[PDB]
Amino acid sequence: LVRDLPQGFSALEPLVDLPIGINITRFQTL
Amino acid sequence: VLSFELAPATVCGPKKSTNLVKNKCVNFNFNGLTGTGVLTESNKKFLP
């Protein structure tokens, strides 16, 4: 499918945890 | 010259794993999991 999000169930596996500790409020893609 | 500082603590000395003794009523500790009981082999399938 390419139009929209397909109807189904899928979990999201964890990848990594990072010990940074910085305040974050906004973002932007690259 | 070294100068330590101190935020998620990340650098510190190693731990010393002891031996594993099962089939006995012991005091276990697995990375902070404390309790008393008898350990035995399991056939369960944990996720990775």
Swiss-Prot record, chain B:
UniProt region (Disordered), positions on chain: 7-28
Organism domain of life: Viruses
Subunit description: Binds to host ACE2. RBD also interacts with the N-linked glycan on 'Asn-90' of ACE2. Cleavage of S generates a polybasic C-terminal sequence on S1 that binds to host Neuropilin-1 (NRP1) and Neuropilin-2 (NRP2) receptors. Interacts with host integrin alpha-5/beta-1 (ITGA5:ITGB1) and with ACE2 in complex with integrin alpha-5/beta-1 (ITGA5:ITGB1). May interact via cytoplasmic c-terminus with M protein. May interact (via N-terminus) with host bilirubin and biliverdin, thereby preventing antibody binding to the SARS-CoV-2 spike NTD via an allosteric mechanism.
Purpose: Attaches the virion to the cell membrane by interacting with host receptor, initiating the infection. The major receptor is host ACE2. When S2/S2' has been cleaved, binding to the receptor triggers direct fusion at the cell membrane. When S2/S2' has not been cleaved, binding to the receptor results in internalization of the virus by endocytosis using host TFRC and GRM2 and leading to fusion of the virion membrane with the host endosomal membrane. Alternatively, may use NRP1/NRP2 and integrin as entry receptors.
Protein name, as recorded: Spike protein S1
Species this chain originates from: Severe acute respiratory syndrome coronavirus 2 (2019-nCoV)
Taxonomy of the source species: Viruses, Riboviria, Orthornavirae, Pisuviricota, Pisoniviricetes
